[PDB]
């Protein structure tokens, strides 16, 4: 469904360590280099801009590997789908508002926390999200 | 407040999505692949408190696998700085935290305020 630049850009935008920001296409190049694999900055770019589509299975393994995710992220929608929800998960942890909310709501009973959820939903109706 | 405790914290807290904590064999293989060589027996002692006081060269190898700074094992401030980050990842497996969290996500800040406002209401 989604393009290969889409899936790749989703990993750059989403997977990266704590206490820091998104990896740069060049820690990548360097990270491959430190394991023999030789990949060109200009190539990695055209890949991520959608000018270079249809890479070989080896290049896709290579990147899927820097990110530590199965290459089947790139070729089966089904697992592209299983993983993307988890991907999406990442972004929400590490979102301030969210951290504050679950912070302040932990230690509320099950009735008053559910009551908290009924209110988020109110607010998602109010803003046109739902 | 040990290198064992701090190393294991990482294993437990820092792993890829839709997956589990890494395994010593992994980190091993992952070092190999970069032309770095470290003994598995060694690594295992290092998590068990059979050896302390690992060489920088080694706190290098590990901190460059976890993709964090080798300052983690050394500086008590960047430790607490960085450790706050892991404990978020934690608090966020906390069940029923995920149910709330994954919704509050789309909401504008003025809207997320209207929530924090309601949680205080519940207290």
Swiss-Prot record, chain A:
Which keywords does the record carry?
Activator, Cytoplasm, DNA-binding, Repressor, Transcription, Transcription regulation, Virulence
Query: Cellular component per GO?
Result: cytoplasm; nucleoid
The protein's job, in short, is: Virulence regulator that has both architectural and regulatory roles. Impacts cell wall functions and pathogenesis through regulation of multiple genes.
Summary of subunit composition and partner proteins = Homodimer. Binds DNA as a dimer of dimers.
Q: Give the DNA-binding residue ranges.
A: 37-49
* Species, as recorded: Mycobacterium tuberculosis (strain CDC 1551 / Oshkosh)
Give this protein's Gene Ontology molecular function annotations: DNA binding
What is the recorded name of this protein?
Nucleoid-associated protein EspR
Q: List localization entries.
A: Cytoplasm, Nucleoid
Swiss-Prot record, chain B:
Q: DNA-binding region(s): which residue ranges? A: 36-48
Cell location: Cytoplasm, Nucleoid
GO CC aspect terms? cytoplasm; nucleoid
Its domain of life reads Bacteria
Q: Which GO terms describe its molecular function?
A: DNA binding
Task: Write the record's keywords in alphabetical order, separated by commas.
Answer: Activator, Cytoplasm, DNA-binding, Repressor, Transcription, Transcription regulation, Virulence
UniProt keyword Transcription present? yes
Per the entry, what this protein does is: Virulence regulator that has both architectural and regulatory roles. Impacts cell wall functions and pathogenesis through regulation of multiple genes.
Q: How does it associate, per the subunit comment?
A: Homodimer. Binds DNA as a dimer of dimers.
Descriptive protein name = Nucleoid-associated protein EspR
Source organism per UniProt: Mycobacterium tuberculosis (strain CDC 1551 / Oshkosh)
